[PDB]
Amino acid sequence: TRLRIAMQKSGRLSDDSRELLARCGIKINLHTQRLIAMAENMPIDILRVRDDDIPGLVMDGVVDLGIIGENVLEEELLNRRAQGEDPRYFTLRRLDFGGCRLSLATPVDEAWDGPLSLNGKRIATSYPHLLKRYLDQKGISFKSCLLNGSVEVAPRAGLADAICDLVSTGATLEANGLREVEVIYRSKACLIQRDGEMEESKQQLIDKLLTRIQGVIQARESKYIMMHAPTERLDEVIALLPGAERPTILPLAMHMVSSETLFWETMEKLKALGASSILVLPIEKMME
Amino acid sequence: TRLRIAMQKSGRLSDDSRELLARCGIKINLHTQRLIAMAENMPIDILRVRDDDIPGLVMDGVVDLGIIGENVLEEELLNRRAQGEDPRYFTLRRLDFGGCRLSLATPVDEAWDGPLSLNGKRIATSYPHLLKRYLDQKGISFKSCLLNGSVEVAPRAGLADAICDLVSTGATLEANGLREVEVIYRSKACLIQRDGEMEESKQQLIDKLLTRIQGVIQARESKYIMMHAPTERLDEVIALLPGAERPTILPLAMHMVSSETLFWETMEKLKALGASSILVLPIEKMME
Amino acid sequence: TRLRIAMQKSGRLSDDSRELLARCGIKINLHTQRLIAMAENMPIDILRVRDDDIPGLVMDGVVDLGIIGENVLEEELLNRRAQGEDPRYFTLRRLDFGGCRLSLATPVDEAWDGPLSLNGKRIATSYPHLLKRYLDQKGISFKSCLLNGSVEVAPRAGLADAICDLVSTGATLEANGLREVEVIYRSKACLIQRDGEMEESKQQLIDKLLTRIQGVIQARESKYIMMHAPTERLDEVIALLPGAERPTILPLAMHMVSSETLFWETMEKLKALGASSILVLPIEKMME
Amino acid sequence: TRLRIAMQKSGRLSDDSRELLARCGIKINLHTQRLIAMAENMPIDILRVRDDDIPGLVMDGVVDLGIIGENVLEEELLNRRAQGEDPRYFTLRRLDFGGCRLSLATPVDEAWDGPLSLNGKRIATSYPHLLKRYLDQKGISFKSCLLNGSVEVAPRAGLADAICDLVSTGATLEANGLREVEVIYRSKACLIQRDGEMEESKQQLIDKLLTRIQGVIQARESKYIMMHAPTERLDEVIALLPGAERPTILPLAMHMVSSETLFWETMEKLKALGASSILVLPIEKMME
Amino acid sequence: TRLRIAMQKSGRLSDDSRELLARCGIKINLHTQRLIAMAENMPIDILRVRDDDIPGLVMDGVVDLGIIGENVLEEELLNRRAQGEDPRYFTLRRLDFGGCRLSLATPVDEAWDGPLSLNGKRIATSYPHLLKRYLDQKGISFKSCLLNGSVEVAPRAGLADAICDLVSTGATLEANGLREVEVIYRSKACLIQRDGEMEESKQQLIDKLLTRIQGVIQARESKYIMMHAPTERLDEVIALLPGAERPTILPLAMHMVSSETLFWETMEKLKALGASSILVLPIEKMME
Amino acid sequence: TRLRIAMQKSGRLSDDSRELLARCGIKINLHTQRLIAMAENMPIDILRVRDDDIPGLVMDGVVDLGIIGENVLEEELLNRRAQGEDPRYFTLRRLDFGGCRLSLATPVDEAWDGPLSLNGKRIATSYPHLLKRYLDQKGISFKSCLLNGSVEVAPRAGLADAICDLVSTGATLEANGLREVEVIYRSKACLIQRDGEMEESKQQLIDKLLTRIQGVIQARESKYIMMHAPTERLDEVIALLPGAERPTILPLAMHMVSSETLFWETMEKLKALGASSILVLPIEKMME
């Protein structure tokens, strides 16, 4: 009828998802107890749902679009495949937020010599399927011990030999006698489309929105760079700076949009390569 | 080795569970990122875990004691029974907190004539097993639609004909075009014991702790009551006031501990029955 | 149709008004964006409105009951009387909360010799009518300068010679070069009834509710007192302790409910009058 | 003596007004209980007052400058005109903040066919004069029902047939069985000057400050734009981009300051018109 | 001139000190940026100062009364004694709040066999004098390493072999590879009087206030106890219950004020000694 | 072993210090109860300590680098010099944050005619050494009265004739009957290096980090400026705009990085000097 996008009502991803669509010029109020939100201008419905529920909402065709993190998505996918189904979706694109990593962590007072060493041990996790996929590929077998939270109790509680969990600061692990030891999966939010024939009108809108998304992400990653054309050694410049648009050379200088960040290392390289008054300006919005 | 109690790390029940054990004189710090907490005095470990994980922790024998709400507990129990297992636990006792009710709610603009009317409709819930038990008993069949949150989207989103959800204020339902319509399950926290032979020493401690629990709950429900012995009509008094301990009559008056509350209705009854200067004093701690 | 009580949606008085009715056993949810709240049990509607709007809501008969502070109430009353109307209401009773005082305050660096001295000066206030009533009675005339807030700018800003404002801690006045100097009106919340013939059924409910109110207030002001009957000098005791219910004397002692507080002065009087082990116990609920 | 600006002590507008003057380089501390604030550098006094009080403060000449929202301003103006006065002020300029709209809203379950349909109905509002002006112009008459808050009770409470209120998200209306239906007044903060001969010295300062204001607003609305001069179709570019300053064309490109925003529609137009690597950079401060 | 009491402006002790004097019926506003507060009724000044500054304020006679914790007090006392002075104060009384303990803590991975073992090691602390007093008495010498905060870095940073710090939950220590190992000083707030001849009038007030203090503390520690006189074994009761006031025996029972708490152990003792329906009621205020 | 930087665990400076090193690309988690933090990438330890403790940590060689405010640093330096030591450190550089000023303030109701007038008066402060240095240079003598906080009580309490304190808004002073009267010391955070031979490897890192620091500070102070080359009067432009990099002149215009801010005065000067469409763009990162 109109476009149905499903997003996390409340958590890690909901702020960034309200923002993405706001930056794509979607006027809708989310500060409301209401869970399906009609859009003001564009023919769009935002279902505010549990992150957990999004993969399935899309897999089942009950909504058209979903912003969900890869891990939650992939885990449910593997889950159903394991019940014997064949759930199907399109990944429109990987988003620029919701980063996190799933990791093997083990007791601190024990030396770690590779995943092999976990063969036949007991691993407590909330991601049994992501974990199983990983050790399977690696030929390692293990006994799963599932917990939906506080996974870091397992070892010190006699429940498991190691855990596999979401990490970022590393704080909890330490607090719990654990240390990261191998990242097994890195995830970000991504934008997925439902399976099956999608009507010309809402497809055109999916397509429109998508182009805004690329633009919003491009603008916040890309940057405007202004250096000093040390004329001779000029080729060795453009290399460290994957341009895509093409430099602009000036008599008096350089000016180009750089899709990656100027990491300090990359700046130092230009330095001791002979470039000067290097600048980097913010870009607020961009088409391209 | 020592007593293992499992409680909700963080949510609806964790404050009341920290408090119960505090009021039973269990010194342990919970303001710590650590998830298994050693007790200072008593030989006790508090595992701070996901509510979801507690029934199973107990069912599996991985801990000795669990404070968990009935619904979460019962739902997992029915779940495993449905996978064909026979998970076993003792209910030591139903606690005085964590009250909530699971309810059928349906769109506001539709008249409701009993659960029968749901036969063959689609009901969205997080408690498929509690719901299924209920309609099964009632001979009604239905198609389940499961969601782990924001269950109140279902109807207005075309996902279901009605939902079955946790309610208290009724706020969300309204916000979402729904109205409560039949409570199907009322729950409170309760205290459960693991199956199998329990060592004499920790049994003695379970037993000790339990007696404190009764005392803490008794003291906060029970009350000390002081009226005026309208001598003639004296029997019609003790009736509305289930005493258990026995009144105390005085020349000058009444004095007794009342296990229930003095609800206004009960006070008015004594009034127009001829009793005066009715008082009710708090009891802070009690044995009995 | 059913009972309409009007209370402050949000501010100084709304917490205490939610509490009063809660303590009278009125189950209704206020944590809702909804402004007219149906009651669960009792046939009652709570309109959640602006304090400012309550006197008029009652004066006009648009609701049946109102919890409003005296000053806001009285000021609007004087206001309409001044437009020539004759607005009419019943004061059911003065409540035990929302205390505050309206005061004359004047610059700190000026000595104050009575209200007389304000004759013909300019006074800035939000309560022009309460102020006018007061100086009128006192035969003093003055020029009003009205402001709906930040009334304490007036003097230091050249707008007035003194202000008349709500005070409690006295903080703002100081911050603004002012000092209290005469309280002209003390107010509390009170409970008012609409004018005109009130149906037998809702009157009976007004009457019921009222009795609960007296009880709730009595219980939180009154107290249970236990001393030592210094037998000889026994009359000089009951005096400082306005009993209302009558002492109870015991061989071994005293026991009675005291409607006022035991202020330290009153305790010291009993002390150096020869009484010992004086106690004061809380009363949680009372009929009487 | 020195410049007196009156601003909202606390609310919707005070943050933006502290910011405007801060961005104009007015050093003054507002984190103080004090309500008239002397400026450090510039000969300026900030009176921190009730928004309600600002129109009159200016209308009366008691201060020189006021930042106040249009609606509050206009309503008081109409108010006095209705008491027969002729209050006078200069609008220096409409500011870039404090946006909001006053709207007719009516019950959801009733179809709406224009303001005409309100003839002789009862409308509850806090803006009786703004409402009256509007229906008057439209030849519609109605009966006013005034409330200073919680205006959205009126209909569901039997007080009015419709309300006229400040709206933004639309949240409350829904919560209260209402829907927006016609905006009757859009407002922003604006900066007003007192009537009467204004001394050369403070006029020069009003004038100075004003120029800063234009600059601060310009910089946060205007933007720096960098495209690719698709040489042939070059005129069709500058059109969608009201420049004011004049484009800058470069051999290798475009560079100009655009006073409006690049709305997505405007970007898409340039796109399918043949422009590429469109950029938009922030401007922090500008003169011009 | 009038009574000068010095208390902690802001921290661990200021809430309890505002409360003590409030419960003694001292009306004074502390919610003010002002640091010397005049009392409304009683001829009293509250200086709101740094805890650190209180011992000296009293030692020097610059104020009359001080609420300060023992450790801060004692440490400064030892400090001056060590500079060769002879600072003098009266301890009026030890208060019922501000408890905390100073402790030796050492790395977790090292076994601890008494303070002796610290001879000649380096101990980091904020309480060098309290620490020095303690090891001196114990005949142990050591090298001090002083830090005013984050004392728990010392060991893991190579700064010291152990630390001596304020502990309560034990949280930080763990977080920092440390474990408590010996408490060397327990402190509470106390109330101290300045040295030298104290005028009859303010002495009388110190004396008055003091009596209120005892009463406030008594009431919150003491409790009202109601059991069942198991007639025969009646002496073995009063023992576990240090009465001070004397039991009261009744035909039908016991009733007395108990200055200590009914710890669970003490309740269990009465239980298996044959007492029943044990109650404990709060006491809000008491003289005695 | 690896680089040891000491920073304020918690206060005025810790946010800016977490940020500086974050902006220098130092990945380390500070949201941890742990006080010595290992760095992820770079061979670096962050000791999170008391600001008070930093000067000494560096002076003693116990750490290598310290971010500390000048006043705290200088005061401790003078302190030890006064105990007869000769503590030694290198100032690498003054940072762009933590600004504050120490000031003489005296009672409001007293006219101030220079520091001379303080000769032989009593001054209460937390910075006795900074104060003593200042009056010493000025040949004024005085009697110190030391307090570690709430220094603004001193005068109104009879403790001193004036105080010397940290000021910013000026709020407290007013609240306490005081007014600033002479700033005696302005401070910012700065970055200091430990004395003695610093190993080639960590020196190289100090050097690296330092260059990042200059860059981070440069980028947030410096700005990109775009005007209109009013060709004739072109020299009078570059003057008000200390360029350092050199302007860039364009046929059609100006473009340069300006290390200072464009203060309004400086913008107005260009204005009435004939420059137009002045812009100032943010710079996010820069080398140079």
Ligand SMILES: N=c1c2ncn([C@H]3O[C@H](COP(=O)(O)OP(=O)(O)OP(=O)(O)O)[C@H](O)[C@H]3O)c2ncn1[C@@H]1O[C@H](COP(=O)(O)O)[C@@H](O)[C@H]1O
């Ligand atoms: N560190 C994270 C963390 N980082 C990112 N996220 C994300 O949560 C996602 C991945 O898990 P899911 O979305 O599948 O979670 P879920 O099953 O829906 O859980 P609910 O939202 O339904 O509770 C994202 O896609 C994330 O944004 C995290 N979720 C949880 N944690 C945890 O926080 C912990 C420790 O953090 P540190 O101590 O700081 O390292 C852990 O114990 C964690 O479990």
Ligand SMILES: N=c1c2ncn([C@H]3O[C@H](COP(=O)(O)OP(=O)(O)OP(=O)(O)O)[C@H](O)[C@H]3O)c2ncn1[C@@H]1O[C@H](COP(=O)(O)O)[C@@H](O)[C@H]1O
């Ligand atoms: N109203 C409740 C509510 N009341 C009580 N509780 C409880 O949550 C419990 C029952 O669900 P579970 O414990 O099984 O929850 P769970 O599966 O562990 O969920 P997580 O804690 O793992 O997220 C308890 O035992 C409760 O204390 C509630 N949990 C959720 N809600 C919800 O809040 C909603 C609406 O409330 P009102 O609008 O105010 O009526 C809903 O939409 C709800 O889902």
Ligand SMILES: N=c1c2ncn([C@H]3O[C@H](COP(=O)(O)OP(=O)(O)OP(=O)(O)O)[C@H](O)[C@H]3O)c2ncn1[C@@H]1O[C@H](COP(=O)(O)O)[C@@H](O)[C@H]1O
């Ligand atoms: N001190 C009070 C204060 N004390 C009590 N109340 C009450 O506000 C009431 C009396 O004014 P109204 O109810 O008529 O107020 P109103 O016109 O409805 O104002 P709104 O709620 O509509 O904004 C009550 O009945 C109170 O509970 C107060 N309302 C305002 N103040 C003010 O707080 C100030 C200063 O307090 P101190 O510095 O701490 O003394 C002032 O400047 C005041 O105006």
Ligand SMILES: N=c1c2ncn([C@H]3O[C@H](COP(=O)(O)OP(=O)(O)OP(=O)(O)O)[C@H](O)[C@H]3O)c2ncn1[C@@H]1O[C@H](COP(=O)(O)O)[C@@H](O)[C@H]1O
């Ligand atoms: N939505 C608004 C709203 N939007 C903007 N403002 C503004 O308040 C102004 C217009 O009213 P006034 O300034 O005249 O208010 P006032 O009479 O001084 O009221 P006080 O500040 O004195 O309380 C501005 O100029 C605004 O910034 C608002 N003020 C109130 N509301 C209300 O918030 C409601 C609902 O919001 P939504 O549910 O999110 O749409 C309502 O019920 C409203 O009354």
Ligand SMILES: N=c1c2ncn([C@H]3O[C@H](COP(=O)(O)OP(=O)(O)OP(=O)(O)O)[C@H](O)[C@H]3O)c2ncn1[C@@H]1O[C@H](COP(=O)(O)O)[C@@H](O)[C@H]1O
């Ligand atoms: N645990 C405490 C603690 N407990 C009580 N207090 C008290 O602080 C007092 C004793 O130190 P002082 O008063 O001498 O402190 P001070 O020198 O004035 O310090 P400032 O107030 O001037 O900062 C009291 O008398 C207390 O109330 C504490 N002060 C500090 N801590 C610390 O909190 C830490 C760890 O707590 P846990 O991890 O929960 O055990 C430590 O690292 C501590 O330093």
Ligand SMILES: N=c1c2ncn([C@H]3O[C@H](COP(=O)(O)OP(=O)(O)OP(=O)(O)O)[C@H](O)[C@H]3O)c2ncn1[C@@H]1O[C@H](COP(=O)(O)O)[C@@H](O)[C@H]1O
């Ligand atoms: N105004 C300040 C203030 N401004 C900046 N800072 C800083 O605190 C520093 C200077 O003092 P120190 O660092 O030596 O402080 P310290 O001895 O370590 O004190 P602790 O952190 O150990 O408590 C910095 O270098 C600052 O960032 C301030 N510290 C305290 N104040 C005070 O806040 C007051 C009043 O502020 P206004 O009323 O707004 O002017 C005072 O009474 C002050 O004492």
